[PDB]
């Protein structure tokens, strides 16, 4: 097409002095790996882009992002990338089939890019704990996650942040919710108590 190939060559590169990485494994996810990493792992945004990112953390990225943003860039085979993706897709309403199948495509071009994905699965969205429909997706995804990526390394963070009844821990999130640049929906972020739970979730599945 006109505009095949124009996009900032700068994407291409990531490096662990200024974009997300844990433990030396970069980050891909959404305004909530990037929040996490902004205020635990000392990362910086990128400076040209209008939608807020660093690294594989983008605002906005849902799965299909995710396939198109490791399409432009290159990293050494065998790679581990620690992985969240999937919030953004199931705020903006997409159907969980599609979800699902993207996933499986997202998961099957890592391998083709002899990338290894880690994975997480989805916290709990905090402003929507009274949206059951939304609710199921999250159950249902996330055990899609877990059977889907059955040879990989599965993290399950959503039980860190609901209490012994399946219901969310508000003492986790902040109070209000905020606008993100890469989507319209409204992000109740990870407090610090809850940023450092999902942290030691993270770290501690990764040890050994």
């Given amino acids: 097409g006109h505009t095949s190939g124009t996009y900032n060559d700068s994407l291409l590169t990531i490096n662990s002095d200024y974009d997300a990485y844990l433990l030396d494994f970069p980050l891909m996810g959404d305004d909530f790996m990037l929040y996490l990493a902004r205020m635990e792992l ?42 969240n993706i999937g919030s953004v897709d199931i705020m903006r309403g997409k159907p969980l089939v599609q979800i699902e199948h993207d996933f499986r495509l997202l998961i099957k071009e890592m391998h083709n890019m002899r990338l290894v994905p ?37 993290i399950d963070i959503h039980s860190c942040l609901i209490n012994e009844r399946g ?5 986790c999130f902040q109070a209000s919710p905020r606008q993100v640049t890469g989507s319209k ?24």
């Fill in 185 to 208: 929906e409204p992000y109740l972020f990870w407090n610090k108590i809850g940023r450092q739970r999902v942290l030691q979730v993270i770290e501690t599945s990764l040890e050994y």
């Fill in 42 to 83: 000392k990362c910086r945004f990128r400076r040209h882009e209008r939608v807020l990112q660093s690294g594989l953390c983008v605002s906005g990225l849902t799965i299909n992002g995710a396939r198109n943003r490791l399409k432009r860039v290159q990293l050494p085979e065998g790679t581990q990338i620690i992985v």
């Fill in 118 to 154: 880690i994975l997480t699965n989805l916290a709990p969205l905090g402003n929507y704990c009274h949206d059951k429909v939304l609710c199921d997706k999250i159950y249902r995804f996330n055990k899609f996650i877990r059977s889907e990526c059955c040879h990989l390394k599965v």
């Fill in 167 to 171: 219901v969310v821990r508000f003492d």
